[PDB]
């Protein structure tokens, strides 16, 4: 290539504007660049990972730096209940005086924004107390950023370039990551909790300059090597302990108490320390499984190759999977993203119900922000997992080398899989929509008693088995004579059962028919999105309408108007369609979470319980109500600190609709229009003197789909974020 993009002369020889766009859009798809090899691929990916790490460290250091420099962290640690955490100061020369006055919150001497990332609760819980601590941490993470960049640059150099064989050493990387990255890190974090966090919560200032001079335990290190570990759990913090103070503080460092610290309404630091320690041990033991350079250990290839059931109901089983995974980075990225997405949702679900940060969960807006954040992140990550799924199926999958294994057999009965997903989605849709519409009609005709309200018996039963006594099923942990109850009666069950039956927190909230309905909506969402994604993955290589689709790649416009028409036939297009359904699904889940929790914090769950049974209830009592303050951020009379969220609300609506533009109108119209504009320019005097170097053309079909989807998603996210934050913080529950 003689011009941008240098990695593709095909695009470089494009005389049009496309050349630029695609240049930007294919910059990270290394596999499709000119003169690339496996080596360059892995090496560039490695360096790119270092770059990403550097960006993360720099980002975190930025957060720490700004909280320390412009925030009220100290004022917050002195009074976490009645201080709004400052994210950063704001200097906008576009501001008028009312704007300056309105945005001066907290103890600030000027306009600021209130943090809803919850970094205050986190940092305070783990041991940070002063601005100086934050500054030192910022400097350290900046140092880590520089180090990571240096490492990328280094390993890019010919002396430090790793071979492809090294990248394909799976057993070693698994051993090291399980034992070191997972194990040693968790053990070391337990170390931080024991040495810094726990003493900090007990009112003991422990830093680098004295941590060697202070005992983490009255009789430290003895009981560990003695085997008298129980001594580390002797006297935990009292039930009247005040966080950050010596009052009510114990001396234990490792416990399994369960439940929440009553003041902070979060998990016990000793519980978390013991947790991280234990899992550190499971990781460390589990990290010595695979064979390396010492003559012992397992061979993953052999393990896979051995797991084939006699009788052949799974064909050749897992024979050959080792190579087809270890050779295909896309398969690896698919597995990675799938797992990561699952545990991201897990993070949301566990962090809302079992908060681990002191004086979070009292901060309602922060909780909502966090849940929505992680659920949308999880959604996108999932769609991506299912996107690198079929890229594997197209770019990497070798049919012959996978003969009759679980994967090839998977492609065999694809119609069965897809058709059954279709049935599930169809059923759930028909009946959930049907029941909702039924109930709405009943409410309309003034007869809500005729509503079909199905009780969530199964989930309620699970809650009862977990020790909740609201439904009175009296099972397992709810049954006084149950062996499961007697087993841990004197360990975690006191605190746990105390927490699960305290109906002011989010630990196993009480559920009714509304919960049933919306849960089935969620089921519909999951099943349908997976229908799109799975169907797109399995038909990525071909279908009866296009048997040679694999010869065209992951992304292409279409195959033409022939054979009936082939719009949106590529696997990429399947992804693109699936994104709408993910946004819809997560929309429903976040709507659910937020409404239920707002009604919880407001003190009237009956609102949700009665109104969520019909869609007019969601529209009127959730959407329409909670926008009152939001839309009044600015008006003909004046403005307040919510003007940002109103402006952002409208911003989101606008971007969303522009998305509609790119999604509804297609290329040819615009191409011809642009032709008339080109004529116009070449025939306009004075302007004639100026000419373009890249011929103006309409965006491509796929490009249009992408840009449209991007406007749509951005609008979606920004709109809901503005509503979430404004509605919640406008009243703070």
Partner 1 sequence: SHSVKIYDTCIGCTQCVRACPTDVLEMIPWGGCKAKQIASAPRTEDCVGCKRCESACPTDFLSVRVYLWHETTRSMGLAY
Partner 2 sequence: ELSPSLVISLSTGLSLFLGRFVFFNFQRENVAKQVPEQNGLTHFEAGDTRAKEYVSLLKSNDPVGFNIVDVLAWGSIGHIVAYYILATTSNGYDP
Partner 3 sequence: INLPSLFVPLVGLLFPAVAMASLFLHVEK
- Report 686-725 residues binding partner 3 (CB under 8 A): 693-694
Rg, Å, the chain Cα set: 29
Pull the structure tokens for residue 389. Answer: 């799924």
- Report 118-157 residues binding ligand BCR (CB under 6 A): none
Q: Smallest distance, Å, CB 431 to partner 1?
A: 40
Q: Which stretch binds partner 2 (CB under 8 A): 18-26, 52-60, 357-365, 484-492?
A: 484-492
Q: Which stretch binds ligand BCR (CB under 6 A): 123-131, 241-249, 329-337, 588-596?
A: 329-337
* Binding-residue total with partner 2 (CB under 8 A): 40
Using CB under 8 A, which of 15, 98, 110, 434 touches partner 3?
110
Q: Smallest distance, Å, CB 679 to partner 1?
A: 7
Task: Decide which of partner 1, ligand PQN, ligand BCR, none touches 386; Cβ closer than 5 to 8 Å per partner kind.
Answer: ligand BCR
Q: Which stretch binds ligand PQN (CB under 6 A): 203-211, 275-283, 340-348, 662-670?
A: 662-670
Task: Round to whole Å and give the CA distance between 247 and 630.
Answer: 42
The answer to whether the CB of 172 falls within 8 A of the CB of 71 is: no
Give 109 or 225: the residue with its C-beta nearer to partner 3: 109
Using CB under 6 A, which of 421, 537, 546, 571 touches ligand BCR?
537
Binding of residue 552 to ligand CLA (CB under 6 A)? no
The set of residues, in sequence order, having a beta carbon less than 8 Å from that of 395 and lying 6+ positions away, is: 31, 328, 330, 553, 554
Q: Which residue has the tokens 């409410």?
A: 443
Phi, psi of 553 (to 5 degrees): 105, -175
Q: Which stretch binds ligand PQN (CB under 6 A): 176-184, 446-454, 697-705, 710-718?
A: 697-705
- Residues paired with 112 in a beta bridge: 89
Beta strand extents in 464-590 (DSSP E only): none
Pull the structure tokens for residue 92. Answer: 């906008």
SS3 state of residue 16? strand
- Residues paired with 261 in a beta bridge: 266
H helical segments located in 287-363: 300-306, 321-326, 329-353
Q: What is the phi-psi region of residue 604: left when phi exceeds 0, alpha when psi lies from -120 to 50, beta otherwise?
A: beta
In terms of C-beta density within 10 A (0-12 exposed, 13-18 middle, 19 or more buried), how is residue 155 classed?
middle
Identify which of 233, 243, 165, 159 has the alpha carbon closest to the alpha carbon of residue 199: 243
Q: Smallest distance, Å, CB 393 to ligand BCR?
A: 6
Using CB under 8 A, which of 88, 129, 207, 291 touches partner 2?
291
Q: Which residues of 41-74 are buried (b: 16+ CB within 10 A; e: fewer)?
A: bbbeebbeebeebbeebbebbebbbbbbebbbbe
Identify which of 592, 77, 507, 73 has the alpha carbon closest to the alpha carbon of residue 265: 507
Give 231 or 706: the residue with its C-beta nearer to partner 2: 231
Using CB under 6 A, which of 124, 260, 331, 645 touches ligand BCR?
331
Binding of residue 536 to ligand BCR (CB under 6 A)? no
Q: What is the phi-psi region of residue 203: left when phi exceeds 0, alpha when psi lies from -120 to 50, beta otherwise?
A: left
- Report 391-430 residues binding ligand BCR (CB under 6 A): 392-393
Q: Which string of DSSP letters, residue by residue, matches 359-394?
A: T-SS-HHHHHHHHHHHHHHHHHHHHHHHHHHHHIII
Q: Smallest distance, Å, CB 284 to ligand BCR?
A: 7
Binding of residue 619 to ligand CLA (CB under 6 A)? no
The answer to whether the CB of 152 falls within 8 A of the CB of 47 is: yes
Task: Decide which of partner 3, ligand BCR, partner 1, none touches 537; Cβ closer than 5 to 8 Å per partner kind.
Answer: ligand BCR
Give 461 or 666: the residue with its C-beta nearer to ligand PQN: 666
Task: Decide which of ligand BCR, ligand CLA, partner 2, none touches 3; Cβ closer than 5 to 8 Å per partner kind.
Answer: none
Using CB under 8 A, which of 29, 101, 412, 682 touches partner 1?
682
Interface positions with ligand PQN (CB under 6 A): 661-662, 665-667, 670, 698-699, 704
Q: Contact positions toward partner 2, by CB under 8 A?
A: 163-166, 168-172, 225-231, 285, 288, 290-303, 322-323, 326-327, 486-487, 490-491
Residues making contact with ligand BCR (CB under 6 A): 281, 331, 334-335, 338, 342, 385-386, 389, 392-393, 537
- Interface residues with partner 1 (CB under 8 A) are 10-11, 13-16, 18, 547-548, 551-552, 556-557, 559-563, 675, 678-679, 682, 695, 697
């Amino acid at each position: 290539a003689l011009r941008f993009p240098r990695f593709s002369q095909g695009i470089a020889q494009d005389p049009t504007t496309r050349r630029i766009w695609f240049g930007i859009a294919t910059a990270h798809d290394f596999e499709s660049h000119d003169d690339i090899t496996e080596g360059r691929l892995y090496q560039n990916i490695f360096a790119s990972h270092f770059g990403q790490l550097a960006i993360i460290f720099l980002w975190t250091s930025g957060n720490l730096f700004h909280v320390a420099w412009q925030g009220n962290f100290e004022a917050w640690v002195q009074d976490p209940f009645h201080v709004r955490p400052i994210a950063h100061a704001i200097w906008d020369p576009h501001f008028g005086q009312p704007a300056v006055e309105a945005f001066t919150r907290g103890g600030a001497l000027g306009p600021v924004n209130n943090a809803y990332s919850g970094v205050y609760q986190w940092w305070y819980t783990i041991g940070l107390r002063t601005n100086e601590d934050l500054y030192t941490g910022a400097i350290f993470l900046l140092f880590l950023s520089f180090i990571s960049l240096l490492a990328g640059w280094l390993h890019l150099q010919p002396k430090w370039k790793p071979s492809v064989s090294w990248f394909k050493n799976a057993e070693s990387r698994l051993n090291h990551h399980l034992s070191g990255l997972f194990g040693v890190s968790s053990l070391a974090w337990a170390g931080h909790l024991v040495h810094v966090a726990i003493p900090g919560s007990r009112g003991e200032y422990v830093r680098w300059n004295n941590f060697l001079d202070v005992l983490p335990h009255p009789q430290g290190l003895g009981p560990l090597l003695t085997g008298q570990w129980n001594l580390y759990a002797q006297n935990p913090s009292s039930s009247n302990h005040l966080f950050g103070t010596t009052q009510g503080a114990g001396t234990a460092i490792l416990t399994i108490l369960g439940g929440f610290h009553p003041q902070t309404q979060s998990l016990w630091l000793t519980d978390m320390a013991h947790h991280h320690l234990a899992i550190a041990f499971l990781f460390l033991i589990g990290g010595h499984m695979y064979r390396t350079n010492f003559g012992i250990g397992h061979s993953i290839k052999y393990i896979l190759e051995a797991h084939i059931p006699p009788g052949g109901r799974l064909g050749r089983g897992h024979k050959g999977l080792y190579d087809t995974i270890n050779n295909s980075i896309h398969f690896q990225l698919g597995l990675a993203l799938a797992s990561l997405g699952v545990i991201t949702s897990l993070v949301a679900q566990h962090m809302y119900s079992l908060p681990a940060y002191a004086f979070i969960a009292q901060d309602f807006t922060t909780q909502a922000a966090l849940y929505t954040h992680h659920q949308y992140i999880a959604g996108f990550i999932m769609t991506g997992a299912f996107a690198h799924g079929p890229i594997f199926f197209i770019r990497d999958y070798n049919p012959e080398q996978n003969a009759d294994n679980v994967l090839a057999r998977m492609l065999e009965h694809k119609e069965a899989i897809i058709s059954h997903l279709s049935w599930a989605s169809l059923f759930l849709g028909f009946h959930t929509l049907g029941l909702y519409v039924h109930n709405d009609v009943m409410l309309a005709f003034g007869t809500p008693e005729k509503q079909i309200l199905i009780e969530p018996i199964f989930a309620q039963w699970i809650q009862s088995a977990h020790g909740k006594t609201t439904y009175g099923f009296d099972v397992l942990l709810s049954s006084t004579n149950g062996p499961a109850l007697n087993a841990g009666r004197n360990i975690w069950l006191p605190g746990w059962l105390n927490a699960i039956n305290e109906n002011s927190n989010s630990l196993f909230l009480t559920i009714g028919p509304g919960d049933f309905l919306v849960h089935h909506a969620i089921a519909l969402g999951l099943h349908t999105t997976t229908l799109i994604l799975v169907k797109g993955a399995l038909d990525a290589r071909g279908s009866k309408l296009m048997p040679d689709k694999k010869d065209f790649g992951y992304s292409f416009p279409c195959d033409g108007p022939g054979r009936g028409g082939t719009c949106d036939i590529s696997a990429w297009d399947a992804f693109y369609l699936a994104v709408f359904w993910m946004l819809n699904t997560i929309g429903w889940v976040t709507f659910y979470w937020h409404w239920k929790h707002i009604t919880l914090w407001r003190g009237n769950v009956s609102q949700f319980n009665e109104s969520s049974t019909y869609l007019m209830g969601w529209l009127r009592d959730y959407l329409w109500l909670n926008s009152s303050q939001l839309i009044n951020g600015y008006n003909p009379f004046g403005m307040n600190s919510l003007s940002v969220w109103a402006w952002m609300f409208l911003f989101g609506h606008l971007v969303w609709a522009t998305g509609f533009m790119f999604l509804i109108s297609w290329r040819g119209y615009w191409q011809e229009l642009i032709e008339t504009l080109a004529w116009a320019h070449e025939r306009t005097p004075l302007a004639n003197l100026i000419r373009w170097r890249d011929k103006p053309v309409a965006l491509s079909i796929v490009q249009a789909r992408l840009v449209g989807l991007v406007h749509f998603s951005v609008g979606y996210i920004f709109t809901y974020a503005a509503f979430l934050i404004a509605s919640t913080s406008g009243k703070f529950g």
